[PDB]
Amino acid sequence: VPWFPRTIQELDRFANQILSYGAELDADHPGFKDPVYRARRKQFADIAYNYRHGQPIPRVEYMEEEKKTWGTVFKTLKSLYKTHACYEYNHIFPLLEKYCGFHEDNIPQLEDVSQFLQTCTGFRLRPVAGLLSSRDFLGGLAFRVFHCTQYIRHGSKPMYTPEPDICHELLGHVPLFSDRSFAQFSQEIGLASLGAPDEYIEKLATIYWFTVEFGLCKQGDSIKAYGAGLLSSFGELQYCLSEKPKLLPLELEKTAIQNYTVTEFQPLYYVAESFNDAKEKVRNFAATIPRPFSVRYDPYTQRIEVL
Amino acid sequence: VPWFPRTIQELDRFANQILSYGAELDADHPGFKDPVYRARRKQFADIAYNYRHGQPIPRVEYMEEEKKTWGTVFKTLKSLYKTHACYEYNHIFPLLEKYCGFHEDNIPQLEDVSQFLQTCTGFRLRPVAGLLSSRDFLGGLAFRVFHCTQYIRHGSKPMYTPEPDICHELLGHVPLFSDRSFAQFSQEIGLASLGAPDEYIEKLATIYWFTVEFGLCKQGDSIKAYGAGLLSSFGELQYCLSEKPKLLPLELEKTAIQNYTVTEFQPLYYVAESFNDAKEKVRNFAATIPRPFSVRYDPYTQRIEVL
Numbered sequence: 001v002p003w004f005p006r007t008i009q010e011l012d013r014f015a016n017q018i019l020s021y022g023a024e025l026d027a028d029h030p031g032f033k034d035p036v037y038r039a040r041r042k043q044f045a046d047i048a049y050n051y052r053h054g055q056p057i058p059r060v061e062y063m064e065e066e067k068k069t070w071g072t073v074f075k076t077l078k079s080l081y082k083t084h085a086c087y088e089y090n091h092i093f094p095l096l097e098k099y100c101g102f103h104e105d106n107i108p109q110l111e112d113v114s115q116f117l118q119t120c121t122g123f124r125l126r127p128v129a130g131l132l133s134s135r136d137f138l139g140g141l142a143f144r145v146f147h148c149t150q151y152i153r154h155g156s157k158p159m160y161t162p163e164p165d166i167c168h169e170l171l172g173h174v175p176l177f178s179d180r181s182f183a184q185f186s187q188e189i190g191l192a193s194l195g196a197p198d199e200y201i202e203k204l205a206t207i208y209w210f211t212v213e214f215g216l217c218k219q220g221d222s223i224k225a226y227g228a229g230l231l232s233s234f235g236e237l238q239y240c241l242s243e244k245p246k247l248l249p250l251e252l253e254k255t256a257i258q259n260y261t262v263t264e265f266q267p268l269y270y271v272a273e274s275f276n277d278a279k280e281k282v283r284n285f286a287a288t289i290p291r292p293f294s295v296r297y298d299p300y301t302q303r304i305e306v307l
Numbered sequence: 308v309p310w311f312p313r314t315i316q317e318l319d320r321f322a323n324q325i326l327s328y329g330a331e332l333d334a335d336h337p338g339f340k341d342p343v344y345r346a347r348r349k350q351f352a353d354i355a356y357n358y359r360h361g362q363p364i365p366r367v368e369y370m371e372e373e374k375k376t377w378g379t380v381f382k383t384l385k386s387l388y389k390t391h392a393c394y395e396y397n398h399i400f401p402l403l404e405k406y407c408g409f410h411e412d413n414i415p416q417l418e419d420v421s422q423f424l425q426t427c428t429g430f431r432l433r434p435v436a437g438l439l440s441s442r443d444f445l446g447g448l449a450f451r452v453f454h455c456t457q458y459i460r461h462g463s464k465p466m467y468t469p470e471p472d473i474c475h476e477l478l479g480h481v482p483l484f485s486d487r488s489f490a491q492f493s494q495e496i497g498l499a500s501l502g503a504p505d506e507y508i509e510k511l512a513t514i515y516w517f518t519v520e521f522g523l524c525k526q527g528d529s530i531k532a533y534g535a536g537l538l539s540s541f542g543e544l545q546y547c548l549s550e551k552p553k554l555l556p557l558e559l560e561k562t563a564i565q566n567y568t569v570t571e572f573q574p575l576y577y578v579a580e581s582f583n584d585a586k587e588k589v590r591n592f593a594a595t596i597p598r599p600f601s602v603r604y605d606p607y608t609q610r611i612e613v614l
């Protein structure tokens with residue numbers, strides 16, 4: 001059986017397992033020729049490397065150019081949320097504005113966002129340096145821990161990122177982790193992953209893609225976006241609720257084996273009935289994963305109980 | 308409906324509701340004529356008065372005479388536990404000895420015991436100045452908070468206390484709060500109390516008396532003590548497992564209305580089948596309490612959810 005963390009502190013083992021040679025080193029990266037950007041990225045990676053569970057997340061003074069990039073992303077995306085984002089997103093965003101400094105001229109600090117999420121659902125952030133394996137990223141969700149980047153995309157191309165950056169994390173993921181039913185749903189994916197064979201981690205990563213990252217959900221008689229990749233993409237958030245993509249009901253024996261690519265708009269989205277329904281579906285799928293035990297998280301002790 | 312705390316921080320309201328004119332002021336108190344003892348008691352009460360949720364519990368340097376009193380109580384009671392205390396007690400006591408400084412020559416600090424309990428079951432301590440109402444004392448249990456005294460009995464009469472003192476709390480109550488099933492059971496009594504009418508608070512206080520304070524439980528084919536009042540009473544711990552008292556099965560419609568006194572050994576004890584069984588019984592009794600809502604604790608946010 002693959003090793004998995006059984007205490008929230010054991011997530012510390014993960015930061016000595018990331019891809020060390022990241023996207024920012026690639027010749028096509030928007031910031032590739034900028035050595036100040038390169039250094040800035042190394043500074044944020046070193047904050048993640050030195051972070052340990054339990055500590056406050058170090059605050060960073062963002063430069064004026066970084067705040068300008070954030071503001072461009074923030075104001076262009078904000079124009080779509082009332083009409084395209086799910087209720088849960090629109091419910092919490094004004095409180096993020098009021099209590100976490102989500103404004104066009106201010107990049108929120110992760111410590112503040114983490115404390116906010118803890119009061120909402122017990123979710124917390126951990127700064128992360130770069131790409132984790134699907135196994136380690138999903139395993140943090142079992143603890144309601146979201147590994148979160150702190151760097152921003154290069155300012156030459158504010159509407160484009162080849163990777164998660166802080167705009168994606170804060171505008172795409174954080175608002176949904178403030179909702180109890182979503183937190184429970186995402187955590188269920190994390191619990192399904194613990195000790196799962198690699199074959200099933202890839203199926204859970206695909207379910208994650210079509211839910212947490214690119215999901216649509218029913219809302220009364222309508223359909224809204226809740227996937228973080230959609231909520232942080234001006235173009236795709238508009239497209240996803242247009243007549244152009246194909247929509248199918250979330251059905252995990254189909255969804256888990258569906259192919260996708262990351263470099264164009266999705267041709268196909270899966271629609272969740274609700275986060276509670278999606279959670280029950282994940283729980284049923286998880287029972288099919290060969291694991292010689294069951295798992296449960298105990299929030300009182302922050303440990304995984306293995307039966 | 309009576310007010311009740313809905314967040315763990317709101318337990319702070321309770322310390323401006325204790326009986327201000329305590330047992331130590333009574334002419335029959337073992338320490339009544341000792342003005343140094345009187346001052347020492349006021350010093351511990353002031354620590355409780357100034358305590359707020361979330362803070363470390365102040366450490367106190369105990370005097371040599373206080374440590375001697377503790378040691379007398381500790382060594383005389385310890386002689387009975389292997390044979391008379393329930394398994395759960397005997398399982399955890401050596402870890403209290405090793406990790407919390409439970410020794411004949413050392414009075415454990417409440418901060419250390421609280422951190423220990425949090426790692427076991429999420430239970431925590433709060434220092435308390437004196438007698439709370441049954442409503443406020445039980446309500447803290449809904450949050451897995453045990454209001455705990457920090458003072459010790461007067462040294463003239465080490466085997467006797469007319470009140471909870473630190474020997475009772477640490478040797479009688481703390482070891483059982485380290486057990487998950489007991490923690491769940493005690494918390495269920497706390498949840499039943501929230502917003503309950505006074506009439507039902509008195510019935511829950513009586514159930515508490517016959518369980519948490521003076522309970523016996525089945526253990527395989529035997530019977531053992533788990534009540535804190537028994538585990539901290541050299542004489543009654545021996546008596547309770549002798550042929551002299553009457554024993555009846557725990558049955559809450561009978562137990563909740565049974566009379567008792569605090570000034571002699573109990574003539575009658577109720578025997579729990581198990582802490583999980585006792586918990587289910589409390590849950591069923593709680594459904595009978597007139598309350599226009601149901602309650603649940605969310606350990607992720609440390610709030611009570613009211614439906």
Ligand SMILES: C[C@H](O)[C@H](O)[C@H]1CNc2nc(N)[nH]c(=O)c2N1
Nearest residue numbers: 128130131132133134137205208
């Ligand atoms: C679970 C699925 O692989 C998903 O794409 C994961 C992979 N690793 C990641 N690593 C980081 N740091 N951030 C993420 O959002 C993810 N996503």
Ligand SMILES: C[C@H](O)[C@H](O)[C@H]1CNc2nc(N)[nH]c(=O)c2N1
Nearest residue numbers: 435437438439440441444512515
């Ligand atoms: C619930 C029942 O009234 C029980 O005797 C309560 C009353 N108030 C108390 N107050 C304090 N501080 N300590 C306790 O153990 C209790 N016990």
Ligand SMILES: [Fe+2]
Nearest residue numbers: 164213228229
């Ligand atoms: Fe993402």
Ligand SMILES: [Fe+2]
Nearest residue numbers: 471520535536
């Ligand atoms: Fe007691």
